[PDB]
Scaffold this active site. Structure first.
Site, PDB file in Angstrom:
ATOM      1  N   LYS A   1      -7.265  35.727   7.077  1.00  0.00           N
ATOM      2  CA  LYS A   1      -8.709  35.957   6.988  1.00  0.00           C
ATOM      3  C   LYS A   1      -9.483  34.771   7.543  1.00  0.00           C
ATOM      4  O   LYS A   1     -10.399  34.255   6.908  1.00  0.00           O
ATOM      5  CB  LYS A   1      -9.131  36.185   5.529  1.00  0.00           C
ATOM      6  CG  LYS A   1      -8.564  37.441   4.877  1.00  0.00           C
ATOM      7  CD  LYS A   1      -8.917  38.696   5.648  1.00  0.00           C
ATOM      8  CE  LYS A   1      -8.607  39.963   4.841  1.00  0.00           C
ATOM      9  NZ  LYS A   1      -7.174  40.012   4.394  1.00  0.00           N
TER      10      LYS A   1
ATOM     11  N   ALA B   1     -11.814  32.160   8.748  1.00  0.00           N
ATOM     12  CA  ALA B   1     -13.252  32.308   8.531  1.00  0.00           C
ATOM     13  C   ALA B   1     -13.973  30.969   8.468  1.00  0.00           C
ATOM     14  O   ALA B   1     -14.781  30.699   7.574  1.00  0.00           O
ATOM     15  CB  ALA B   1     -13.509  33.127   7.259  1.00  0.00           C
TER      16      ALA B   1
HETATM   17  O1  LIG Z   1      -9.992  45.269   3.784  1.00  0.00           O
HETATM   18  C1  LIG Z   1      -8.902  44.770   3.481  1.00  0.00           C
HETATM   19  C2  LIG Z   1      -8.232  43.817   4.284  1.00  0.00           C
HETATM   20  C3  LIG Z   1      -7.012  43.373   3.860  1.00  0.00           C
HETATM   21  O2  LIG Z   1      -6.327  42.514   4.617  1.00  0.00           O
HETATM   22  N1  LIG Z   1      -6.459  43.788   2.681  1.00  0.00           N
HETATM   23  C4  LIG Z   1      -5.138  43.253   2.320  1.00  0.00           C
HETATM   24  O3  LIG Z   1      -4.172  44.319   2.414  1.00  0.00           O
HETATM   25  C5  LIG Z   1      -3.315  44.306   1.250  1.00  0.00           C
HETATM   26  C6  LIG Z   1      -3.600  45.533   0.360  1.00  0.00           C
HETATM   27  O4  LIG Z   1      -2.514  45.531  -0.569  1.00  0.00           O
HETATM   28  P1  LIG Z   1      -2.456  46.750  -1.612  1.00  0.00           P
HETATM   29  O5  LIG Z   1      -1.713  47.966  -0.911  1.00  0.00           O
HETATM   30  O6  LIG Z   1      -1.561  46.133  -2.778  1.00  0.00           O
HETATM   31  O7  LIG Z   1      -3.814  47.126  -2.083  1.00  0.00           O
HETATM   32  C7  LIG Z   1      -3.578  42.965   0.536  1.00  0.00           C
HETATM   33  O8  LIG Z   1      -2.722  41.938   1.067  1.00  0.00           O
HETATM   34  C8  LIG Z   1      -5.048  42.686   0.885  1.00  0.00           C
HETATM   35  O9  LIG Z   1      -5.303  41.281   0.866  1.00  0.00           O
HETATM   36  C9  LIG Z   1      -7.111  44.713   1.927  1.00  0.00           C
HETATM   37  O10 LIG Z   1      -6.635  45.143   0.891  1.00  0.00           O
HETATM   38  N2  LIG Z   1      -8.311  45.178   2.340  1.00  0.00           N
END
Ligand SMILES: O=c1cc(O)n([C@@H]2O[C@H](COP(=O)(O)O)[C@@H](O)[C@H]2O)c(=O)[nH]1
Ligand SMILES: O=c1cc(O)n([C@@H]2O[C@H](COP(=O)(O)O)[C@@H](O)[C@H]2O)c(=O)[nH]1
EC number: 4.1.1.23
Lengths: 218, 219
Positions: free
Chosen positions: A64, A66
Protein backbone atom coordinates in the site's frame (compact mmCIF):
# COMPACT_ATOMS: atom_id res chain seq x y z
CA UNK A 1 0.38 -12.07 -15.70
CA UNK A 2 -0.91 -15.66 -15.72
CA UNK A 3 -2.49 -16.48 -12.36
CA UNK A 4 -3.29 -20.16 -11.80
CA UNK A 5 -7.03 -20.71 -11.27
CA UNK A 6 -7.55 -16.94 -11.23
CA UNK A 7 -6.91 -17.21 -7.48
CA UNK A 8 -4.37 -15.25 -5.44
CA UNK A 9 -3.82 -16.28 -1.83
CA UNK A 10 -3.65 -13.38 0.66
CA UNK A 11 -1.22 -14.83 3.17
CA UNK A 12 -1.86 -12.66 6.25
CA UNK A 13 -1.00 -15.18 8.94
CA UNK A 14 1.66 -13.69 11.18
CA UNK A 15 3.67 -16.77 12.12
CA UNK A 16 6.23 -18.26 9.73
CA UNK A 17 5.39 -21.89 10.52
CA UNK A 18 1.65 -21.46 9.97
CA UNK A 19 2.10 -19.28 6.89
CA UNK A 20 4.43 -21.81 5.23
CA UNK A 21 2.30 -24.80 6.26
CA UNK A 22 -0.98 -23.32 5.02
CA UNK A 23 0.56 -22.10 1.78
CA UNK A 24 2.00 -25.58 1.32
CA UNK A 25 -1.44 -27.11 1.86
CA UNK A 26 -2.96 -25.09 -0.99
CA UNK A 27 0.06 -25.01 -3.31
CA UNK A 28 -1.54 -27.25 -5.94
CA UNK A 29 -4.29 -24.64 -6.40
CA UNK A 30 -2.26 -21.45 -6.72
CA UNK A 31 0.97 -20.06 -8.12
CA UNK A 32 0.55 -16.49 -6.88
CA UNK A 33 0.72 -15.28 -3.28
CA UNK A 34 0.03 -11.78 -1.96
CA UNK A 35 2.30 -11.09 1.00
CA UNK A 36 1.60 -8.02 3.09
CA UNK A 37 2.84 -6.23 6.17
CA UNK A 38 1.16 -8.55 8.70
CA UNK A 39 3.52 -11.36 7.67
CA UNK A 40 6.53 -9.24 6.67
CA UNK A 41 6.57 -7.15 9.88
CA UNK A 42 6.23 -10.30 12.00
CA UNK A 43 8.80 -12.49 10.23
CA UNK A 44 11.03 -10.24 8.10
CA UNK A 45 11.53 -9.55 4.41
CA UNK A 46 13.48 -12.83 4.09
CA UNK A 47 10.08 -14.59 4.06
CA UNK A 48 9.69 -13.59 0.40
CA UNK A 49 12.75 -15.55 -0.76
CA UNK A 50 11.64 -18.43 1.45
CA UNK A 51 8.30 -18.60 -0.41
CA UNK A 52 10.11 -18.54 -3.75
CA UNK A 53 12.45 -21.31 -2.58
CA UNK A 54 9.67 -23.53 -1.27
CA UNK A 55 6.91 -22.91 -3.82
CA UNK A 56 8.32 -21.02 -6.82
CA UNK A 57 5.18 -18.89 -6.62
CA UNK A 58 5.04 -15.31 -7.81
CA UNK A 59 4.96 -12.81 -4.96
CA UNK A 60 2.92 -9.63 -4.89
CA UNK A 61 4.06 -7.35 -2.08
CA UNK A 62 0.94 -5.66 -0.80
CA UNK A 63 2.59 -2.69 0.84
CA UNK A 64 0.00 0.00 0.00
CA UNK A 65 2.86 2.32 -0.82
CA UNK A 66 1.68 5.78 0.17
CA UNK A 67 4.52 8.20 0.79
CA UNK A 68 6.31 11.07 -0.96
CA UNK A 69 8.15 10.18 -4.20
CA UNK A 70 11.61 9.95 -2.61
CA UNK A 71 10.44 7.59 0.12
CA UNK A 72 8.32 5.56 -2.31
CA UNK A 73 11.41 4.95 -4.42
CA UNK A 74 13.30 3.60 -1.41
CA UNK A 75 10.41 1.36 -0.37
CA UNK A 76 10.15 -0.13 -3.85
CA UNK A 77 13.90 -0.74 -4.06
CA UNK A 78 13.96 -2.54 -0.71
CA UNK A 79 10.89 -4.57 -1.68
CA UNK A 80 12.23 -5.71 -5.03
CA UNK A 81 15.64 -6.48 -3.48
CA UNK A 82 13.75 -8.95 -1.29
CA UNK A 83 12.48 -10.72 -4.42
CA UNK A 84 8.92 -9.46 -4.79
CA UNK A 85 7.63 -9.68 -8.36
CA UNK A 86 5.20 -6.80 -7.97
CA UNK A 87 4.18 -4.16 -5.47
CA UNK A 88 0.80 -2.58 -4.67
CA UNK A 89 0.80 1.23 -4.58
CA UNK A 90 -1.87 3.72 -3.46
CA UNK A 91 -3.07 6.27 -5.96
CA UNK A 92 -4.54 8.74 -3.47
CA UNK A 93 -1.12 10.42 -2.80
CA UNK A 94 -0.99 11.52 -6.45
CA UNK A 95 0.84 10.99 -9.73
CA UNK A 96 4.41 11.83 -8.69
CA UNK A 97 4.27 9.20 -5.94
CA UNK A 98 3.00 6.57 -8.39
CA UNK A 99 5.63 7.47 -11.00
CA UNK A 100 8.39 7.01 -8.41
CA UNK A 101 7.25 3.38 -8.03
CA UNK A 102 6.88 2.82 -11.78
CA UNK A 103 10.47 3.98 -12.29
CA UNK A 104 11.95 1.48 -9.82
CA UNK A 105 9.74 -1.32 -11.11
CA UNK A 106 10.98 -0.66 -14.64
CA UNK A 107 14.59 -0.63 -13.45
CA UNK A 108 14.27 -3.99 -11.65
CA UNK A 109 11.97 -5.84 -14.05
CA UNK A 110 8.88 -5.74 -11.85
CA UNK A 111 5.25 -4.60 -11.91
CA UNK A 112 3.27 -1.93 -10.08
CA UNK A 113 -0.38 -2.58 -9.15
CA UNK A 114 -2.43 0.57 -8.51
CA UNK A 115 -5.06 0.61 -5.78
CA UNK A 116 -8.19 2.30 -7.18
CA UNK A 117 -11.12 1.73 -4.83
CA UNK A 118 -10.78 -0.26 -1.63
CA UNK A 119 -13.25 -2.88 -0.43
CA UNK A 120 -13.98 -1.85 3.19
CA UNK A 121 -16.80 0.46 4.33
CA UNK A 122 -14.43 3.36 5.09
CA UNK A 123 -13.47 3.46 1.42
CA UNK A 124 -16.77 5.30 0.88
CA UNK A 125 -15.56 8.37 2.77
CA UNK A 126 -12.76 9.62 0.49
CA UNK A 127 -11.46 6.86 -1.77
CA UNK A 128 -14.63 6.02 -3.66
CA UNK A 129 -15.14 9.60 -4.84
CA UNK A 130 -11.55 9.73 -6.14
CA UNK A 131 -11.36 6.22 -7.56
CA UNK A 132 -12.45 6.80 -11.18
CA UNK A 133 -9.97 9.68 -11.37
CA UNK A 134 -7.23 7.49 -9.84
CA UNK A 135 -7.95 4.89 -12.52
CA UNK A 136 -7.72 7.51 -15.29
CA UNK A 137 -4.47 8.68 -13.72
CA UNK A 138 -3.21 5.11 -13.98
CA UNK A 139 -4.16 5.05 -17.65
CA UNK A 140 -2.36 8.36 -18.26
CA UNK A 141 0.74 7.06 -16.44
CA UNK A 142 0.80 3.79 -18.37
CA UNK A 143 -0.15 1.64 -15.40
CA UNK A 144 -1.24 -1.82 -16.55
CA UNK A 145 -2.17 -3.51 -13.25
CA UNK A 146 -4.97 -2.45 -10.93
CA UNK A 147 -6.76 -3.46 -7.73
CA UNK A 148 -10.49 -2.91 -7.13
CA UNK A 149 -13.24 -3.99 -4.74
CA UNK A 150 -15.06 -7.35 -4.77
CA UNK A 151 -17.55 -5.88 -2.30
CA UNK A 152 -18.88 -3.39 -4.91
CA UNK A 153 -19.20 -5.18 -8.26
CA UNK A 154 -20.81 -2.12 -9.86
CA UNK A 155 -17.69 -0.12 -8.93
CA UNK A 156 -15.43 -2.96 -10.07
CA UNK A 157 -17.26 -2.96 -13.42
CA UNK A 158 -16.80 0.79 -13.81
CA UNK A 159 -13.10 0.47 -13.00
CA UNK A 160 -12.78 -2.25 -15.65
CA UNK A 161 -14.48 0.09 -18.16
CA UNK A 162 -11.98 2.83 -17.41
CA UNK A 163 -8.83 0.69 -17.63
CA UNK A 164 -9.96 -1.43 -20.58
CA UNK A 165 -9.75 -5.15 -21.28
CA UNK A 166 -5.96 -5.13 -21.84
CA UNK A 167 -5.21 -4.03 -18.27
CA UNK A 168 -4.90 -6.59 -15.49
CA UNK A 169 -7.32 -6.26 -12.58
CA UNK A 170 -7.25 -8.17 -9.29
CA UNK A 171 -9.85 -7.95 -6.57
CA UNK A 172 -9.92 -8.55 -2.80
CA UNK A 173 -12.93 -8.66 -0.50
CA UNK A 174 -14.02 -12.15 -1.57
CA UNK A 175 -15.45 -14.40 1.13
CA UNK A 176 -14.88 -12.91 4.56
CA UNK A 177 -15.83 -9.37 3.43
CA UNK A 178 -18.86 -10.61 1.51
CA UNK A 179 -17.76 -10.62 -2.11
CA UNK A 180 -18.69 -13.48 -4.41
CA UNK A 181 -15.95 -15.28 -6.37
CA UNK A 182 -17.88 -15.80 -9.62
CA UNK A 183 -19.47 -12.37 -9.72
CA UNK A 184 -16.09 -10.73 -9.06
CA UNK A 185 -14.52 -12.65 -11.95
CA UNK A 186 -17.04 -11.10 -14.35
CA UNK A 187 -14.80 -8.03 -14.12
CA UNK A 188 -11.50 -8.95 -12.46
CA UNK A 189 -8.88 -11.23 -14.00
CA UNK A 190 -8.16 -12.74 -10.59
CA UNK A 191 -9.62 -12.80 -7.09
CA UNK A 192 -7.64 -12.32 -3.90
CA UNK A 193 -8.74 -14.56 -1.02
CA UNK A 194 -7.33 -14.48 2.52
CA UNK A 195 -9.32 -15.58 5.56
CA UNK A 196 -11.82 -17.81 3.73
CA UNK A 197 -8.83 -20.01 2.96
CA UNK A 198 -6.23 -19.43 5.68
CA UNK A 199 -8.65 -19.46 8.66
CA UNK A 200 -10.66 -22.39 7.29
CA UNK A 201 -10.68 -25.67 9.21
CA UNK A 202 -9.31 -27.23 6.03
CA UNK A 203 -7.61 -24.62 3.82
CA UNK A 204 -7.10 -27.05 0.92
CA UNK A 205 -10.79 -27.94 0.89
CA UNK A 206 -11.69 -24.25 1.11
CA UNK A 207 -9.50 -23.42 -1.89
CA UNK A 208 -10.86 -26.43 -3.80
CA UNK A 209 -14.40 -25.32 -3.01
CA UNK A 210 -13.84 -21.81 -4.34
CA UNK A 211 -12.28 -23.16 -7.51
CA UNK A 212 -15.16 -25.61 -8.00
CA UNK A 213 -17.60 -22.68 -7.76
CA UNK A 214 -15.81 -20.84 -10.60
CA UNK A 215 -14.87 -23.88 -12.68
CA UNK A 216 -16.74 -22.61 -15.74
CA UNK A 217 -14.69 -19.40 -15.61
CA UNK A 218 -11.30 -21.09 -15.85
CA UNK B 1 2.12 15.02 24.84
CA UNK B 2 5.55 13.53 24.12
CA UNK B 3 8.32 15.94 25.12
CA UNK B 4 10.37 16.27 21.94
CA UNK B 5 13.84 17.58 22.62
CA UNK B 6 14.57 20.79 20.69
CA UNK B 7 11.26 20.41 18.82
CA UNK B 8 13.25 18.39 16.27
CA UNK B 9 12.53 14.86 15.05
CA UNK B 10 15.06 13.02 12.91
CA UNK B 11 13.65 11.22 9.86
CA UNK B 12 16.11 8.36 9.65
CA UNK B 13 15.63 7.15 6.07
CA UNK B 14 19.12 5.79 5.42
CA UNK B 15 18.80 2.17 4.33
CA UNK B 16 22.08 0.85 5.64
CA UNK B 17 22.19 -0.14 9.33
CA UNK B 18 25.78 1.05 9.83
CA UNK B 19 25.11 4.48 8.33
CA UNK B 20 21.75 4.86 10.07
CA UNK B 21 23.32 4.02 13.43
CA UNK B 22 26.32 6.27 12.85
CA UNK B 23 24.28 9.31 11.90
CA UNK B 24 21.71 8.87 14.65
CA UNK B 25 24.50 8.51 17.22
CA UNK B 26 26.16 11.69 15.95
CA UNK B 27 23.04 13.78 16.49
CA UNK B 28 21.93 12.13 19.74
CA UNK B 29 22.81 15.14 21.90
CA UNK B 30 20.30 17.21 19.91
CA UNK B 31 17.39 14.82 19.34
CA UNK B 32 15.55 12.32 21.58
CA UNK B 33 12.86 11.40 19.04
CA UNK B 34 13.45 9.46 15.84
CA UNK B 35 11.05 8.68 13.02
CA UNK B 36 11.87 5.31 11.46
CA UNK B 37 10.05 4.38 8.25
CA UNK B 38 9.89 1.59 5.73
CA UNK B 39 13.11 2.50 3.89
CA UNK B 40 15.09 1.43 6.98
CA UNK B 41 12.71 -1.23 8.31
CA UNK B 42 12.36 -3.07 4.99
CA UNK B 43 16.14 -3.00 4.58
CA UNK B 44 17.18 -4.04 8.09
CA UNK B 45 14.19 -5.59 9.84
CA UNK B 46 11.87 -4.61 12.68
CA UNK B 47 14.75 -5.39 15.05
CA UNK B 48 16.20 -2.02 14.00
CA UNK B 49 13.69 -0.49 16.43
CA UNK B 50 15.19 -2.67 19.19
CA UNK B 51 18.67 -1.64 18.20
CA UNK B 52 17.91 2.09 18.25
CA UNK B 53 16.34 1.75 21.69
CA UNK B 54 19.41 -0.13 22.90
CA UNK B 55 21.92 2.37 21.49
CA UNK B 56 20.15 5.72 21.96
CA UNK B 57 17.82 7.31 24.48
CA UNK B 58 15.25 7.96 21.75
CA UNK B 59 11.52 7.56 21.36
CA UNK B 60 10.57 5.82 18.13
CA UNK B 61 7.79 6.89 15.80
CA UNK B 62 7.12 4.19 13.21
CA UNK B 63 6.20 6.01 10.02
CA UNK B 64 4.34 3.20 8.31
CA UNK B 65 1.59 5.29 6.63
CA UNK B 66 -0.87 2.60 7.64
CA UNK B 67 -3.41 2.49 4.83
CA UNK B 68 -5.29 -0.81 4.67
CA UNK B 69 -8.66 -2.27 5.66
CA UNK B 70 -9.43 -2.31 9.41
CA UNK B 71 -8.51 -5.98 9.88
CA UNK B 72 -5.09 -5.57 8.26
CA UNK B 73 -4.47 -2.24 9.98
CA UNK B 74 -4.95 -3.97 13.34
CA UNK B 75 -2.35 -6.62 12.46
CA UNK B 76 0.15 -3.98 11.33
CA UNK B 77 -0.28 -1.90 14.48
CA UNK B 78 0.06 -4.96 16.71
CA UNK B 79 3.27 -6.08 15.03
CA UNK B 80 4.68 -2.56 15.15
CA UNK B 81 3.97 -1.97 18.83
CA UNK B 82 5.21 -5.48 19.71
CA UNK B 83 8.58 -4.49 18.20
CA UNK B 84 8.82 -1.49 20.53
CA UNK B 85 7.57 1.54 18.60
CA UNK B 86 6.18 4.29 20.83
CA UNK B 87 3.83 5.56 18.11
CA UNK B 88 2.70 4.79 14.58
CA UNK B 89 1.69 7.08 11.70
CA UNK B 90 -1.59 6.23 9.99
CA UNK B 91 -3.32 7.51 6.85
CA UNK B 92 -6.77 9.06 7.12
CA UNK B 93 -7.83 8.80 3.49
CA UNK B 94 -8.92 5.15 3.85
CA UNK B 95 -11.66 6.38 6.22
CA UNK B 96 -12.79 6.27 9.83
CA UNK B 97 -13.05 2.51 10.33
CA UNK B 98 -9.43 2.10 9.24
CA UNK B 99 -8.29 4.83 11.63
CA UNK B 100 -10.41 3.45 14.48
CA UNK B 101 -8.80 0.03 14.06
CA UNK B 102 -5.41 1.62 14.72
CA UNK B 103 -6.67 3.69 17.66
CA UNK B 104 -8.15 0.57 19.24
CA UNK B 105 -4.87 -1.33 19.10
CA UNK B 106 -2.94 1.70 20.35
CA UNK B 107 -5.34 2.05 23.31
CA UNK B 108 -5.09 -1.65 24.13
CA UNK B 109 -1.30 -1.66 23.83
CA UNK B 110 -0.61 1.67 25.57
CA UNK B 111 0.88 3.45 22.55
CA UNK B 112 -0.04 6.35 20.25
CA UNK B 113 -1.41 7.02 16.77
CA UNK B 114 -0.42 9.98 14.62
CA UNK B 115 -2.82 10.85 11.81
CA UNK B 116 -1.59 12.03 8.40
CA UNK B 117 -3.72 15.01 7.32
CA UNK B 118 -2.20 16.74 4.29
CA UNK B 119 1.09 15.54 2.79
CA UNK B 120 3.97 17.79 1.78
CA UNK B 121 4.80 16.66 -1.76
CA UNK B 122 3.35 18.13 -4.98
CA UNK B 123 1.19 15.06 -5.66
CA UNK B 124 -0.70 15.76 -2.43
CA UNK B 125 -2.58 18.48 -4.31
CA UNK B 126 -4.38 15.95 -6.52
CA UNK B 127 -6.57 14.19 -3.93
CA UNK B 128 -5.19 14.59 -0.41
CA UNK B 129 -5.42 18.37 -0.13
CA UNK B 130 -9.15 18.42 -0.91
CA UNK B 131 -9.80 15.78 1.74
CA UNK B 132 -7.37 17.03 4.38
CA UNK B 133 -9.61 19.38 6.39
CA UNK B 134 -12.22 16.63 6.63
CA UNK B 135 -9.56 14.06 7.55
CA UNK B 136 -8.44 16.35 10.37
CA UNK B 137 -12.04 16.90 11.54
CA UNK B 138 -12.57 13.14 11.43
CA UNK B 139 -9.50 12.72 13.60
CA UNK B 140 -10.89 15.18 16.11
CA UNK B 141 -14.23 13.34 16.14
CA UNK B 142 -12.43 10.01 16.69
CA UNK B 143 -10.37 11.39 19.57
CA UNK B 144 -7.04 11.45 17.70
CA UNK B 145 -4.54 13.58 19.62
CA UNK B 146 -1.49 13.50 17.32
CA UNK B 147 -1.31 14.73 13.74
CA UNK B 148 1.09 15.24 10.84
CA UNK B 149 0.83 18.19 8.44
CA UNK B 150 2.90 19.81 5.68
CA UNK B 151 5.77 22.23 6.19
CA UNK B 152 5.71 23.06 2.49
CA UNK B 153 2.25 24.72 2.70
CA UNK B 154 2.22 27.08 5.71
CA UNK B 155 -1.34 28.21 4.97
CA UNK B 156 -2.55 24.60 5.04
CA UNK B 157 -0.53 23.77 8.16
CA UNK B 158 -2.09 26.81 9.83
CA UNK B 159 -5.63 25.73 8.92
CA UNK B 160 -4.99 22.16 10.08
CA UNK B 161 -3.70 23.49 13.42
CA UNK B 162 -6.95 25.46 13.80
CA UNK B 163 -9.04 22.38 13.10
CA UNK B 164 -7.25 20.14 15.60
CA UNK B 165 -6.95 22.86 18.23
CA UNK B 166 -4.01 24.04 20.32
CA UNK B 167 -4.22 21.01 22.65
CA UNK B 168 -3.49 18.51 19.88
CA UNK B 169 0.09 17.53 19.02
CA UNK B 170 1.23 18.39 15.49
CA UNK B 171 4.47 17.38 13.79
CA UNK B 172 5.54 18.53 10.35
CA UNK B 173 7.87 17.16 7.64
CA UNK B 174 9.06 18.88 4.48
CA UNK B 175 11.62 21.06 6.26
CA UNK B 176 14.94 21.61 4.49
CA UNK B 177 15.18 19.39 1.42
CA UNK B 178 11.56 19.94 0.37
CA UNK B 179 11.77 23.69 0.97
CA UNK B 180 10.03 24.24 4.30
CA UNK B 181 11.45 26.69 6.84
CA UNK B 182 12.11 25.51 10.43
CA UNK B 183 11.00 28.70 12.20
CA UNK B 184 7.93 29.33 10.06
CA UNK B 185 6.82 25.73 10.47
CA UNK B 186 7.13 25.93 14.26
CA UNK B 187 4.60 28.77 14.27
CA UNK B 188 2.03 25.98 13.91
CA UNK B 189 3.72 22.62 14.53
CA UNK B 190 4.92 21.42 17.92
CA UNK B 191 7.92 19.77 16.23
CA UNK B 192 9.56 19.63 12.84
CA UNK B 193 10.65 16.45 11.10
CA UNK B 194 13.99 16.69 9.26
CA UNK B 195 15.61 13.97 7.17
CA UNK B 196 18.04 14.66 4.32
CA UNK B 197 19.15 18.11 5.52
CA UNK B 198 20.67 16.25 8.46
CA UNK B 199 21.43 12.72 7.34
CA UNK B 200 23.06 13.63 4.00
CA UNK B 201 25.13 16.47 5.48
CA UNK B 202 28.91 16.16 5.67
CA UNK B 203 28.47 16.74 9.41
CA UNK B 204 24.98 15.73 10.55
CA UNK B 205 25.65 17.03 14.07
CA UNK B 206 26.57 20.46 12.72
CA UNK B 207 23.48 20.39 10.50
CA UNK B 208 21.22 19.62 13.46
CA UNK B 209 22.96 22.24 15.61
CA UNK B 210 22.50 24.82 12.87
CA UNK B 211 18.79 24.10 12.60
CA UNK B 212 18.42 24.39 16.37
CA UNK B 213 20.40 27.65 16.48
CA UNK B 214 17.99 29.08 13.90
CA UNK B 215 14.96 28.33 16.13
CA UNK B 216 16.63 28.95 19.50
CA UNK B 217 14.10 31.58 20.61
CA UNK B 218 11.24 29.12 19.97
CA UNK B 219 12.48 26.52 22.45
O1 LIG C 1 -9.43 -2.95 -0.97
C1 LIG C 1 -8.68 -3.81 -0.49
C2 LIG C 1 -7.31 -3.90 -0.83
C3 LIG C 1 -6.59 -4.92 -0.28
O2 LIG C 1 -5.30 -5.08 -0.61
N1 LIG C 1 -7.14 -5.80 0.62
C4 LIG C 1 -6.27 -6.86 1.15
O3 LIG C 1 -6.71 -8.12 0.61
C5 LIG C 1 -6.78 -9.11 1.66
C6 LIG C 1 -8.25 -9.48 1.96
O4 LIG C 1 -8.14 -10.64 2.80
P1 LIG C 1 -9.51 -11.34 3.23
O5 LIG C 1 -9.94 -12.35 2.08
O6 LIG C 1 -9.06 -12.14 4.54
O7 LIG C 1 -10.57 -10.34 3.52
C7 LIG C 1 -6.05 -8.50 2.88
O8 LIG C 1 -4.64 -8.79 2.81
C8 LIG C 1 -6.31 -6.99 2.69
O9 LIG C 1 -5.26 -6.24 3.30
C9 LIG C 1 -8.46 -5.70 0.92
O10 LIG C 1 -9.00 -6.48 1.68
N2 LIG C 1 -9.19 -4.71 0.37
O1 LIG D 1 3.76 14.73 4.11
C1 LIG D 1 4.74 14.07 4.44
C2 LIG D 1 4.64 13.04 5.39
C3 LIG D 1 5.80 12.38 5.71
O2 LIG D 1 5.80 11.42 6.63
N1 LIG D 1 7.01 12.68 5.11
C4 LIG D 1 8.19 11.91 5.54
O3 LIG D 1 9.04 12.82 6.25
C5 LIG D 1 10.41 12.64 5.84
C6 LIG D 1 10.88 13.88 5.07
O4 LIG D 1 12.30 13.72 4.95
P1 LIG D 1 13.17 14.90 4.28
O5 LIG D 1 13.50 15.97 5.38
O6 LIG D 1 14.47 14.13 3.79
O7 LIG D 1 12.42 15.52 3.16
C7 LIG D 1 10.44 11.35 5.01
O8 LIG D 1 10.62 10.23 5.88
C8 LIG D 1 9.03 11.32 4.39
O9 LIG D 1 8.67 9.96 4.13
C9 LIG D 1 7.07 13.68 4.21
O10 LIG D 1 8.12 14.01 3.69
N2 LIG D 1 5.94 14.36 3.89
Amino acid sequence: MDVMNRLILAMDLMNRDDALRVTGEVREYIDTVKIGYPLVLSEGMDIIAEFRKRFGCRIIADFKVADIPETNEKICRATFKAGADAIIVHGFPGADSVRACLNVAEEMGREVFLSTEMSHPGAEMFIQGAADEIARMGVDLGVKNYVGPSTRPERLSRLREIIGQDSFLISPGVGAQGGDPGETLRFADAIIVGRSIYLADNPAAAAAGIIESIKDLL
